[PDB]
């Protein structure tokens, strides 16, 4: 068991932040700190005002270091909202006293872990997110794991994946602080939020295997997630986007759903939104789960449509049926507009695949994909036009299973 070396476990428990490691650290909460009453029972901090949130963790000075020798690991879930690539410097989790200990900060697109021996000697390691893949900010939940061996390496992991490895050379030992401070403090030289859950410290150096077991065990992998990593829900407006076409939003021409190039990457708030509706599932609690049967509603010009197949003006390709927006009764939705969802998460995104349902059952008929095709929609008459459309590949779609063009994301409209 890896829990044997766990010396701190900061968790929200019955609307109270506490250490559940058995080592009974003092947890003091000040200012504007919000606790989530539902999963993942996170706590929320801001950079706003003089009365911003502050969580002080004071560890028992003795008992926690009996098992520690040369190595320690820090793990936690974190989400930062409007993590812009030009973000000013912030210290977010501080554990430095008298120029000794460790600190976690954010600057630009970097999450930086600093290890301080004294005022003259320190080393840092970092994760820098891919700006091109996150033009609207890195605003999703991610899992951080930092391992340190004083006679070996500092290592940083994001979502179970090893990001960087730096040899500890300068430092020859650390006098750790009693205190860990969760607070958003601007470095002395627009407003940001931070969510944390399950902050753990281990008295050993966790390996790749341990980190992944940990990473997965803190998740409900059967629950589909939205773009930011929160639980995907029914009866909620989302912007539906294809992973391969992030600069595209949803529009309508005639029967067809068409994809247009978005204005900018300030946010995702452009074009029409979908609402996910449940038909079938094992649990009934508003959350979208793997193997659920569902359909999609959308409001366009004071009318509500459902997504469904339609016959295109001319053939698009073998086994290809276009998906459009139709004003149809439930019988037609079940026959031609029902989908089976299956989550597929990667390091880069929280996404899902959608399979065409056979009469609103869990039997599969095709996979929902995307492509550009030349045909006629709306009032097109004289000429065929190229349209980027959602398309279902029916019967034969084995080579599309591993294709990212079948990965769909949902950004909350809010």
């Amino acid at each position: 068991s890896i829990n044997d070396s766990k010396i701190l476990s900061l968790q929200n428990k019955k609307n109270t932040l506490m250490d559940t490691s058995g080592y009974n650290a003092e947890v003091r909460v000040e200012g504007n700190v919000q606790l989530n009453p539902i999963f993942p029972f996170d706590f929320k901090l801001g950079s706003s005002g003089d009365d911003r949130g502050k969580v002080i963790v004071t560890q028992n000075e003795n008992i926690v270091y009996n098992a520690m020798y040369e190595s320690f690991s820090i793990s936690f879930w974190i989400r930062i909202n409007k993590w812009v690539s030009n973000l000013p410097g912030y210290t977010i989790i501080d554990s430095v006293k008298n120029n000794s200990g460790w600190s976690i900060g954010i600057i630009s697109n970097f999450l930086v872990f600093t290890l301080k021996q004294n005022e003259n000697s320190e080393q840092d390691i970092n994760f820098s997110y891919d700006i091109s893949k996150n033009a609207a900010g890195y605003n999703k939940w991610f899992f951080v794991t930092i391992t340190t061996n004083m006679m070996g390496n500092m290592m940083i992991y994001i979502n179970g994946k090893l990001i960087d490895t730096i040899k500890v050379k300068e430092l020859t030992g650390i006098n750790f602080s009693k205190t860990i401070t969760f607070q958003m403090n601007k470095i002395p030289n627009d407003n940001i939020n931070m969510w944390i859950r399950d902050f753990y410290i281990f008295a050993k150096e966790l390996d790749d295997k341990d980190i992944n077991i940990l990473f997965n065990s803190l998740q409900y992998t059967n629950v589909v997630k939205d773009y930011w990593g929160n639980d995907l829900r029914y009866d909620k407006e989302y912007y539906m986007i294809n992973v391969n076409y992030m600069n595209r939003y949803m529009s309508k021409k005639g029967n067809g759903i068409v994809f247009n190039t978005r204005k900018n990457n300030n946010d995702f708030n452009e074009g029409y939104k979908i609402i996910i509706k449940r038909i079938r599932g094992n649990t009934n609690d508003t959350r979208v789960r793997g193997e659920n049967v569902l359909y999609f509603n959308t409001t366009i010009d004071n009318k509500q449509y459902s997504l469904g197949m339609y016959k295109p003006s001319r053939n698009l390709g073998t086994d290809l049926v276009p998906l459009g927006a139709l004003d149809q009764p439930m019988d037609e939705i079940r026959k031609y507009g029902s989908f089976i969802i299956q989550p597929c998460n990667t390091f880069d995104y929280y996404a899902s695949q959608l399979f065409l349902s056979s009469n609103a059952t869990t039997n599969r008929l095709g996979i929902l994909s995307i492509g550009s095709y030349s045909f006629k929609l709306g009032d097109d008459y004289w000429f065929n036009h190229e349209y980027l459309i959602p398309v279902i590949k029916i019967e034969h779609y084995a080579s599309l299973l591993e294709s990212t063009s079948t990965h769909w994301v949902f950004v909350p409209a809010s």
């Binding site: 197949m309 295109p312 053939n315 049926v321 039997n363 008929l365």
Partner: peptide, 16 residues
């Protein structure tokens, strides 16, 4: 059957 559902989809959504 599945073969029936594919035949139905071909008849309804393909030209022709």
């Amino acid at each position: 059957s599945q073969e029936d559902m594919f035949a139905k989809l071909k008849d309804k959504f393909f030209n022709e």
